[PDB]
Structure formats: structure tokens, C-alpha cells
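2024-03-11 09:14:02 INFO queue: dequeued item CLEC1B protein, len=122
2024-03-11 09:14:02 INFO validating residues
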Amino acid sequence: SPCDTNWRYYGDSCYGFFRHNLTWEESKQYCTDMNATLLKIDNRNIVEYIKARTHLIRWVGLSRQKSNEVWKWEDGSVISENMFEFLEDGKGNMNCAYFHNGKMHPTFCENKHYLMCERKAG
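2024-03-11 09:14:37 INFO prediction written
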């Protein structure tokens, strides 16, 4: 495969799963330290791939800059309309999302969870 050891190739991306129990911001930093980014999930096929590759709660790259604002990926794009089916209930001041077993869940950014990162395949 085109991805380094501890990374997995799917579509056009390399995905890494890291059992570091960190806040969302700490997880962002962890990915940055590996020249990577928190995951973007932009279709059902990637939802299915990720849940087939991990069954622990892990942060993804979906967040809002402030309470009650729109949900965006790290690349600054708002979550696609098709992807709302995969975003579960939350409160207005839950501003970061994790992924677990096929669903994204809003929660408090200061909570600790494992993470995953993404790099473009080359």
C-alpha cells in the first residue's frame, strides 16, 4: 500500500488510528505533529469503512467555532447535507464531534477520547 505503517489506505486517503486519550484540541495537535489532520467523513462509504476499522469512540475533524454555530470540517467546509443523517443529537454548546460505530455525536470539546488522523495518499 501507499500508506506508512500504522496507516490504512482507502479511496485517496491514508487513515491512522491512535489510542491517545486526549481533548479535541489536543487531538488536533496530535495529528498536526504527524503532518496530518483530524478525519473528514464525506459519504456513507467512508462511514462504513471507518466503522469496519475501529469500534472505539474517536474524535473526528467536525467542530463549530462557537456554541450554536454551523458544523464544519477542518478544511473549513460545512458538513454536506447528505451527511446530516449521520450526525446524532446534541446540545448547542457541544462544539466537537466524535465518531462511533457509524454515527457522529456532538459532545464537549474538553472531554477525552481516542482519535484518528488523515493524510492524502501519495
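2024-03-11 09:14:37 INFO annotate: The chain has one domain: 1-122.
2024-03-11 09:14:38 INFO item closed
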